[model samples]
Target chain A: EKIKLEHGAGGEIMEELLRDVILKTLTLKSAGGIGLDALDDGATIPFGDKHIVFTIDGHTVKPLFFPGGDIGRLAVSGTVNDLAVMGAEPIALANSMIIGEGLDMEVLKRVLKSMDETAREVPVPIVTGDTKVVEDKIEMFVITAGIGIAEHPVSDAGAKVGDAVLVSGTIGDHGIALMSHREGIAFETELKSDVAPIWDVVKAVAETIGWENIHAMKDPTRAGLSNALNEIARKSNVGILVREADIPIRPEVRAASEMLGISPYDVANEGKVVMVVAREYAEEALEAMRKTEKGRNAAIIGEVIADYRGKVLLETGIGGKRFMEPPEGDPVPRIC
Target chain B: EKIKLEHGAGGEIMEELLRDVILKTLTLKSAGGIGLDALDDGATIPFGDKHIVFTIDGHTVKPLFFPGGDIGRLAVSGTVNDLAVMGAEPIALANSMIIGEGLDMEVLKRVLKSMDETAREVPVPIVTGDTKVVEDKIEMFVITAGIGIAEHPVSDAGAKVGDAVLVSGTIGDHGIALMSHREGIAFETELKSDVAPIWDVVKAVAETIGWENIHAMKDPTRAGLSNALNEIARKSNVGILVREADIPIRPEVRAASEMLGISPYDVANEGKVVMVVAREYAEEALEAMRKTEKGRNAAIIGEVIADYRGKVLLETGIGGKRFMEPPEGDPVPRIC
Candidate 1:
């Protein structure tokens, strides 16, 4: 069967493709007793005296460079966030670049420089890397793998009854920004990706409340908030209830979504994080997150519950309820 | 100025390109402190308990699949060897694949299966990964980053004046095999790449002799023996003296090199390792290597000396001496 672009999406179809095609063919053992459980925001590996978390991400959004951020900044932020959401203290990173044969040397230099600068801001060292030149057909893509140390053991499977589900800052800003750039959609004020490193925010939360109380965490990228929430519910074998009014959304992003007929929940966000904290620690966690620049719009959007076990339910602002499922297929292609 | 394929070649032009373009463009403090140190066999990072040695390699030889090995096998062996030669025990791998649009899904599956099979043999888990699909313009390339723990902290900077240089087995096997396949050069028997994981041999050596006494280690790849020796000599601020009669060369590989007008010393070999051992422990190191199936042909081919500092001098069969320098550029293009 011909592979469709949806295979890269972070939804149900993407998960099925990964299982039936990629994982089956590769014969990979399940990381967390099952494939879906292991596909959480980060990987946890046992290390001597402590646990180590590792994650890798590819940044391939169009325009190569973007307003407020470029592929380089996105690469660092994506990896750092992956480590952070998994309750890890981001430490080191390794970057690999595959540049097209005819790509301008200057552009390549700028990208590398931006990556270096942003990585330094997060205080993570890019200690090892590789560079390959492919024929012009390949375009340009950057991949980064980050390693971090965990202060306490944590996993997506830790969500329990009465846990509070919260998200830091506004959602859909990044997706709207990319859509504006790709479709040439003009807005009263230009939409820009909310791209920034979240290591500090995550570190603060982990330090203040301790890692054990943090049930699960993730950064909503290609599939946005819906996919992230569904993954948490599936992995923890619990139910989630999200009040649409409680989830923070930017005015510009919402307006753009309305114009484009896109759901704000389905659009990607770069500088936001979805976190699940124990009920007793939820308020403290929110306070810790709000202190960071990237978490100014932090809010408790939902709570873990016994109803609708193993599924996520959203209470819309219009007094209607709907089941939120993992993305079934790709909504946006190559948006990091 | 336009960039040429030769810029990727490990020659003077490539060096100039790296210095003038890449290095100049990304002038970070870390970049300057470690200019071409990364160009060596592997890198040394400061991990908590012990040093972590890491390397990233891209496997993109044409035909994708080969007899006895494919891109998958090459990827594992390539990265494992990178760590092994640095006296490290490889533990985990991170894989990133860039697949062309319309590429055969079956082929990708098979390749990944091969990778998993080989990875099982080495006993290292592929802990994290990312995948992306590019337009048909770009060909498929797989980049892998491997992390290994250094047991004794060995480096090319540690070659001593009286250390004995040893090679695990025959040289030029991989390079000659690739040339035979690419150019359709007939041999008395079919030649295939000796692309096998060497972690077992590495573990044996490390366990038998311990890491401290071993001065330097490397796999003769790309620029072959000439480059490997030259790098060790330059890095440790010592001289390397190799006896022509002691270097292991298969008859068929020798003949192939002669026919192609290429020096066997400058041809790549995948399943081999070279070590600079303390003279007192040379016998133990050689015996430890012989315990492995691929190291039966291991031999002490050279020694380190204070005289002729930073030079690799090869003693010819006729008792003549010649300075062995790093290849001006890659002899085989896209072979790796």
Candidate 2:
């Protein structure tokens, strides 16, 4: 059998590929801490008294230069967000670039400049890297590996009943921006990717309400909020009840998604976090998140529930609730 | 200005690209440890009492499967060797794979199997990974990030003036094998790649002679021995005098290199290490290296010298000496 596009789409098909092909073939999973079996944002290696959160991401966004963020920014932010979502403070990053022959030197320099700026903004040091030149078939790609330290490591499967679900900021902007640009669709309000390293926001909330109060966290990247919520629901063995009207999304992104025939709920987001926090501290967590620039649009959109376990229910503004099925794949591919 | 094929060839041109384009643009080079400035095998982050060595490599080997190994094995061993060369005991690895659409599932599975076996052999756990699919332009590539811990971290720039240079096993086997197979230059001896994880051999030598005695170590991979030695010489501000006749080369690899019109000294080797040891401990280190299966053909090839600073002088079989210039680019690209 041959692999399909959905196999890399970060949805049900991609999950199946990982389970049946990847995880099944590898026997040694854990190296003393959280490992491949969790399918979490990143893995952890237990240190003396702290856990080292490690994550790696590959950026292959088409056009290389997107509306608000290029591959460079996306690459650094993706790894930082992954580590941050797991309750880790990113300490170092390793970069690897594969460039095809004949790429413009100025373009490469600009990308490196963008990466340096992002790393400095996150204040996470860019420590090591490798560079390779390949055939022209592969124009260019960047892989960033992050190392973070966490005293209390968090997992996506820790959401409990009665936990409140919160989004750090607007969703679907990244996907819509890339899709609109690719399709040459114009909107009265220009939409741009919400690509930023969000460790500051995550750190603020964690320090304010305590690490244990934030039960589960994930960046709604590829496959977007729907898939991320479904994963939390499935992993925690609980159900999610989210109000669609309360979800934070940009007006231009919604309009563009509608015009593109894609779901604002199922596309990707570069700089957003979906958090399941303790109900008692939910308000404090939301306020803490809102204090940061990236999390200015924070909203408590849902809550974990016991009913409809392993599923997500969306309460529409029309006085009706419907089950939100996880999409088979992201509507906008390669947005990240 | 554009990036040429030589820019990623791990030679003089690659060094210029990194210095002028990458390092010049990035401001943050270190995370409180050895970092991009050193251009060592890996970067280190000071953990509690030990240094956590981190390194990442991207595998874009053509044909995916070669005579002795596949990309999966190459990806795993490449990272392991990078960490091992720094005197670090690899603890975990993170893998990220980008697959082009329409790839065969069986091919991926076979690659995964090879990766699993190699990791188990090295005893390094693959803790986490990410998967993505892209357009068919990039058939496939694997990026592996390694995490290793060491009480005493070694650098490739620590070669002393009186140190002896030794290699674990033969040179040019990997590059010659790939070149022969790619060019359809059949050899009777069945030239296979010397692709294998070499931590065990390194461990033996480090334990036998103590880590401090081994001043510098490198895998001598892309751009082969010439570049690796030149890097050591330039970084350590010393000169090296090597006997060309003492360098280990399989008869078949030598013959094939002659036929291909490529220098055996300028090609890559997967399961090889060029070590600079304390002059007094050189014999002990050589014997320790020979004890391991991969290092059975170990040989002491040269010595660090005070003359001809920042250059490599080679003694010919006829008792003549000449300077060995580092190649501008690797003859065989993407061997790693």
Candidate 3:
């Protein structure tokens, strides 16, 4: 039996493998089941004084280097966003690097330097790390474990009816940029990844709108906005109605998606956030998000509803309502 | 140019590479200079209200499965021991698993189960983790990041001259067993790794003897007793004189080392500790260690010296004095 790359794609196959193979073999004492909950991006463990939020991520993008950012930054940002979306104030991180034997020391050093610099920029320390030389693998892969201290009494499973959905910035920038670079697709203008720290955006929403009223938050990563909305709907067991015109998509990204036969809503993003807030606090949250770098294109894209439960429906630009489906298969491998 | 394995060993060649490639490329803020002195078992970082001890380690032993333990147990124990020896109470851990393509899912599941069980045994949570698949690398390699709560008002750089040196148990068992198993050298009886969680023994010593009186402690891991003691002496800037006869060595290990033409002193150990304690507390610490499962063979190995600074001298069985040198190269590659 040959193993397909989808096995590592963090989708259906990956989720099943985690449940059937990983979680079943180990006994977890926690009340919640092991594996990512449909709502949150990371796991939260209740401790005495505070709750700890933890997440791990792996980066294996081809070419290792990219136009705007490389695997090093993705490794850090991917993990940081995971913690942030779970209501955690990102604190410390640990990095593990695997370098193929005969890989250039210069490249390895450059990557490590980038990792260290990016980590410092976010003010999180790389407290501990490990490095290994593998004999016959690709040059480099980085895995990061991020820990964050969650603000008190916040839960993503609390979205009430009429909650408003807001996104931090334009979607599909990261996915489209990476796709263009990797596939050598040409465009008159250059595009770069929207890969930056989301801690500031998370802080803005948390501080202004309050954690309790902020129903749910997610970095529309690997599977994109469609998957993010689907996950929230399923977790809250409520209906979500999105206005297609209000969802912010950069013109460049939309153009790139058209050329590649991809949906902008289904493409990955790294620096974008999708948040569900109580309708009363939605305006304030959107205003707060607009002040951040990645949030300039912020928009109130949707709202939660009492009817059509556990389903996400989007009104098209042409005024047709369609049920939004969960993303299928890997749109792009290791786009992180 | 031919690259020898020694270039990757954490010795002279690795040091040169670090200086030329890493340090020159990036501006490190608080990293200690390269070489043995900078290679601490754990680093102490000042966090809010307390100091946190952090360390990262990789386990890459061949065969993946071994007598008495496997890679899973090694990953936990190796990291926990790094924290324990630094006078820290281990709290959380993060694991990164790299599995070669085509590796059996069953074996990986077993390893994950072992990791969870071992972490629970040590009472530390595997809070966060990452997983990756490599195309043609060796079957399995695991790296762990361990966070420990440092004891108040205690540090590893507090060794005093005239402190007594102690070993918690028999030396060289793990290394001898691994060598024999790998080289197909059979003894009269099969030897097994002395791999077990030593946190209890460490806690007992710390509580009974107190951290203030314990100058330094280290698990004799990869490079064995000689390298461990050499590190302590250099780190403390003190001299150490060990009585060869006082150091505990299992008969089976001695025989196995002899058959393999390797020095017992250079062999690795998984479940043994070498501690430097104040002379007044040496006897009490030895008694405290005796109560633990692996510490029944605890003994007084030597004492800190006022003369011969930065050196570790071991008096031979035949009464000749020789400087104990750190293992020059990877005596046993990927042995955790």
Candidate 4:
């Protein structure tokens, strides 16, 4: 059998594929710290008193230019946020560009400029890069790698019983926006992707509530809130009880998801963080998040409980509880 | 105008394209240390006592499989060698894969295994990575980003007057091997890529002749020795006098290059290093390099002079000298 699109669609299938091929093939998973085996957004290299966080991501979104951010911005933001979620302060970035042979110079320049702009937003300097031109297939592909320094590294597997779940912003905007734009559907509300660097928001919250109080954190990107929550719960061996009414979702995103027959919980969001915080600091984390422009729609969406370990349960607005299964794959592919 | 193949062929044209597009677009050139501005194989971030070297490369070699190596090995070797030439001991690596849908599972597994084998040879752990499966065009592309630590970071722009030039192993093997293979030529002498992770060789040479004595270092890849030497000379504002007869080239590689109308000096070599060592320690450097398997054919090929300012002069065996111009582009595409 051949590889399929769902193999990289960022859900159950993608995880299995990675585990079977990549993880199984490598022997040394960590360089004496949290690494590939942990399957977190980034890995840490223990350097003296600091942990050097490193990560890499490839952006292959179609139509390089989207409603709010282009591939350049997405490339930078994706790497920066990956490091940020790991409790690392972004330091530097290296990018590799595989430009199609026939790509216009202006288009390349614009993407480069956008990359620079987004890097500046996180105040991270792009230090080195490689460029390759190939026959035009999908126009261009950008891969960015980032370096960061952290005094205390937070991982997604740290949620404890009695922890509260907090989401930094509204979910499903990025996937829905791109989907609507691609289909040329102009809705009453102009839905734009919430694609951006969330380092500032992360830093604010960490400084406000202390990094240690944040039990677990993940950016809901590919499979959005449901996938992220399920991962956190399974990794921490805790049960997650989510309140559907408390989850922040724009009205337009909800309507679009229903109309398109896609679940909002499984769509992607570029600039949102699903965090598990110590119960006492839950309100403080929310307040800190709302103070930042990127996290203005922050909400307390759920809590970690002892029941149903390794699973996520959603409390619907109608007062019925149902297990929130991780999506087979993100309905919208290449939204990142 | 649209970009073309030559724009990424690793020569003068590729340099101009990167400068005009990427460099011109970025605002912050460095993160308080040697960075993109240096145009070195890697960038360094100053830590307390160590310089953290970071670099990235994209592998888009055609056919994926070639003589003696595949894209997987090339991807790891290319990044590892980039760091090695910078006087760095690679610490960790992060890779991202863009696999085209419909690729065979067995092929993917094979490539992953090759990548793991190459990484283990250098003993550098692949700490993190990402994967995406897209519509099939090119089967797959691998981008690797590496982190290394160095006490004294070496750059290509450090060639000093009276420095001796050294090359590890023979040149033109990699590009020629792939070229002949692609053209389905069965040569009298079987040709193979010299692709490998050269950290052991670089480490031995550095320890033998102190890092400071090794003035400048580069891996002659892409447009090969001509482009690499030209870059060092132009960057350091020094003239290079190379002995054409002394430059090591395997008999088969030389014959193949001549038959294909490609300059042996302008063809890529994967497992090689071109170093500028201080005259006093040049012999020691060569002695140490010869002790390593990868550098068994090490030789003192030339000397850095001040006569030509920013050019490389090749001294032919016939008592004649000619300016060795940098190639417009690598005749063999996607050899790396």
Which candidate, 2 or 4, has the higher DockQ? 4
Off by over 4 Å in 3: A1-4, A29-40, A43-49, A153-156, A308-310, B1-8, B15-39, B45-50, B153-156
For model 3, how does the per-residue alpha-carbon lDDT over A153-250 read when each residue is reduced to its tens digit? 34445567989999998988887888888778756756888877788888898899788888887778876888778777777889899998898887
Q: What is each candidate's DockQ, to 2 decimals?
A: 0.43, 0.81, 0.34, 0.85
- The TM-scores of all predictions, comma-separated, are 0.93, 0.99, 0.90, 0.99
lDDT of 4 by residue, A1-336 (tens): 899999888999998887787889988779878899899999998888989999999999978998889999999999999999999999999999998888888999899999999988889999999998888467999999999998899999999999999999898999988888888755765678999999988889889989999889899888878899999998899999999899888888888777778888898888888889999999999999999999999999999999899899989868799999898888897776
**What does the lDDT come to for candidate 3?**
0.74
Residue A64 error, candidate 3, Å:
1.6
Fraction of native A-B contacts kept, per candidate: 0.30, 0.78, 0.25, 0.83
Tens-place lDDT per residue, model 4, B1-336, is: 988999989998999987777788998768878889788999999998989999999999987988889999999999999999999999999889999989999999999899999999999999999988888477999999999999999989999999999999898899888888887655775689999999999899888888889899999999999999999999999999999999999888888777788887887889999999999999999999999889999999999998797899999967799999999889888765
Docking class of 1: acceptable
Worst 10 residues of 1 chain B by lDDT: B28-37
**Model 4: colliding residue pairs:** none
DockQ, computed on Cα atoms, for candidate 4: 0.85
What is the per-residue lDDT of model 1 for residues A1-336, given as tens digits with 9 covering 90 to 100?
Answer: 655566666677767766686666665433321122376666666666666677777667777887678898898889888888877887677667766667777777788788878877877766666665555545568888777777675666778989999999898888777887778776765788988888788777888898878888878877899988887888788999999889898887888788877787886788888889989999999999999887878999999998787898989967788887666753666777
DockQ of predicted candidate 3: 0.34
CA shift of A246, model 3, Å: 2.9
Model 2 residue A58 distance off true place after TM-score fit, in angstroms: 0.9
**Which lDDT value does model 3 have at B60?**
72
lDDT of 3 at A143: 76
Worst 10 residues of 3 chain B by lDDT: B28-37
lDDT by residue for model 2 (A1-336), tens = 877878878888998888887888999889878899898999998898999999999888888998898999999999999999999999999999988888889889989999999999989888888898887566689999999999998899999999999999998898888999998876665578999999999899988999999999999988999999999999999999999999987888888888999888898899999999999999999999898889999999999999899999999977689998998888777765
